[PDB]
Amino acid sequence: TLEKFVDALPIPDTLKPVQQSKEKTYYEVTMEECTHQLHRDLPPTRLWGYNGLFPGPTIEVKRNENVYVKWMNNLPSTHFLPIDHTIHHEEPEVKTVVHLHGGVTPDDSDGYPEAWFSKDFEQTGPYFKREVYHYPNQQRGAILWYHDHAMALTRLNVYAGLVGAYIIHDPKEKRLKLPSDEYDVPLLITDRTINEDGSLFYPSAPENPSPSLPNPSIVPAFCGETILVNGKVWPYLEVEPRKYRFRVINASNTRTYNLSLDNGGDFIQIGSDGGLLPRSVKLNSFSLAPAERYDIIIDFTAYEGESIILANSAGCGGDVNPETDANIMQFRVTKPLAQKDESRKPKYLASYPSVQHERIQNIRTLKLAGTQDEYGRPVLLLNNKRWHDPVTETPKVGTTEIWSIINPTRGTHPIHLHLVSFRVLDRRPFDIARYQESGELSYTGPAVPPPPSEKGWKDTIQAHAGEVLRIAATFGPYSGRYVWHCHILEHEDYDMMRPMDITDP
Ligand SMILES: [O-][O-]
Ligand SMILES: [Cu+2]
Ligand SMILES: [Cu+2]
Ligand SMILES: [Cu+2]
Ligand SMILES: [Cu+2]
């Protein structure tokens, strides 16, 4: 097992524009097969990287900044990870498309799974319109991130290394004096399994595969043996004894983390997926499922000299192993102060989302279910529909709906809707055997309103087993063709994803 905390945390450089003016900012990002050492003791690992980097470069934009990105595929024509040809039915093997997660984006710049392109746009999927994506950024300051979304290949192209951070800065938040600049640090967390030769391992089949199974075969879940942050296995970060802001992004395929500091110190949560909370929240720990973001302050002022482990208590296919996946990274409070800490950790951050009083146009009830294929594998389905079935989720532009998500399965699914952020209304336990036998929904306890961490704006939300989760979303300001899906990539690809039409009457 790799020795923990021997590599310094990489800080991705901030991408420089190819062209910028006051009316427009223009970037170019090229997907490249590259090699990078992931740990002191490993040979360099072959990866797919935005601009040949893992993670990709951090993009930083201002609210309402008029941004264009030309995302280019300059990858090999063959993949290096195991492709299952039975999950989707002449197309190029390597297909890519960039989704800016949390982006308030016109539909043809949103990275629709069927808007894929091969190397140099030589072949393009049926929903492809444009090479240069347009991000108007007319939305709250928040932590976003970008990753590959290509139909039936997401779990592989993301696992290969196609992820990066994207920060929107709202200049009206500056007066809050949150830690900034070098004291504001993204933490992109990805679990990986790495072979002795340093090559990525991703399973070609379930363990002890029925001889029925195809080869390769998709697996329902991926749990990595090692944890990386910003592309290094279990790294350390040297910090000054003062306040830092961290943008924590879970960029893992399946794995959920439950994070804490091993010296018992607090996080101060200042933000969720959709931006600043109305009030900061002190937390001893927090759950973070794939695609969720936490915007937090950690105060190292009282901890000079100490080494503090960011620890993880959430299992993935089993309990955490204290020597490995119980560890994320280590902070070392040994860097001298560069200047007085002038940052703040204010209580009052933003307006409450509940100041809004929108009419409920529609209430959808959606179930998380599935079936078994001709090979005996589980196929995960939203409302027992396939991706290819005619669209059923058709909200009207400008209106607000409540979605009631029924989860009678054994696990949590982190549910994500494109375009919008939403409010969490409540969660409520129900009798699973009764639901499965009759389709009748019988509650076993009262509704539970969201904890303070879920009283801001969310875009990816944990829907736990044996519960009904209700959220409220306003669909806008764009109309068009989007998606909603589980953000466990192994579920998403087979087949837990649905189109979503936002209609203009
Ligand atoms: O990921 O959407
Ligand atoms: Cu995403
Ligand atoms: Cu998204
Ligand atoms: Cu799922
Ligand atoms: Cu998506």
UniProtKB/Swiss-Prot annotation:
Optimum pH is 7 for SGZ and bilirubin oxidation. Optimum pH is about 4 for ditaurobilirubin oxidation. Optimum pH is below 3.0 for ABTS oxidation. Optimum pH is 8.0 for UB oxidation, whereas optimum pH for DB oxidation is 5.5. It is found in: Spore coat. Highly thermostable. Optimum temperature is 45 degrees Celsius for SGZ oxidation. Optimum temperature is 75 degrees Celsius with ABTS as substrate. Its main location: other. Cu cation 3 binds at H149, H418, H485. Residues 44-80, 95-172, 234-312, 372-503 form the Plastocyanin-like domain. Changing R423K: 25-fold decrease in catalytic efficiency with ABTS as substrate. 30-fold decrease in catalytic efficiency with SGZ as substrate. When expressed on the surface of E.coli cells, CotA was shown to possess improved enzymatic properties, including higher thermal stability and stronger inhibitor tolerance. It has high enzymatic activity against three industrial dye types: an anthraquinone dye, Acid Blue 62, a triphenylmethane dye, Malachite Green, and an azo dye, Methyl Orange. It may help decrease the costs and simplify wastewater treatment, and therefore, surface-displayed CotA shows a great potential for industrial-scale dye decolorization. Cu cation 1 binds at H99, H416. Changing D110A: 5-fold decrease in catalytic efficiency with ABTS as substrate. 785-fold decrease in catalytic efficiency with 2,6-DMP as substrate. Changing L425F: Retains approximately 50% of the wild-type activity with both ABTS and SGZ. Its EC number is 1.10.3.2, 1.3.3.5. Binds 4 copper ions per subunit. The 4 copper centers adopt structures classified as type 1, type 2 and type 3. GO terms for cellular component: outer membrane-bounded periplasmic space. Disulfide bonds: none annotated. Changing R140K: 357-fold decrease in catalytic efficiency with ABTS as substrate. 152-fold decrease in catalytic efficiency with SGZ as substrate. Changing H487C: Decreases copper content. Strong decrease in catalytic efficiency with both ABTS and SGZ. Changing D110N: 33-fold decrease in catalytic efficiency with ABTS as substrate. Almost loss of activity with 2,6-DMP as substrate. Monomer. Belongs to the multicopper oxidase family. Multicopper oxidase that catalyzes the oxidation of a variety of substrates, including phenolic and non-phenolic compounds. Substrates include syringaldazine (SGZ), 2,6-dimethoxyphenol (2,6-DMP) and the non-phenolic compound 2,2'-azino-bis(3-ethylbenzothiazoline-6-sulfonic acid) (ABTS). Has no tyrosinase activity. Is implicated in the biosynthesis of a brownish pigment that characterizes sporulating colonies of B.subtilis, and which appears to be a melanin-like product and to confer protection against UV light. Glu-492, located within the entrance channel of the trinuclear center, plays a key role in the protonation events that occur at the trinuclear center and in its stabilization, controlling therefore the binding of dioxygen and its further reduction. Asp-110, situated in the exit channel of the trinuclear center, and its hydrogen bond connectivity are highly relevant for the overall reactivity of the laccase but do not appear to play a critical structural role. This is Laccase. The lineage of its organism: Bacteria, Bacillati, Bacillota, Bacilli, Bacillales.
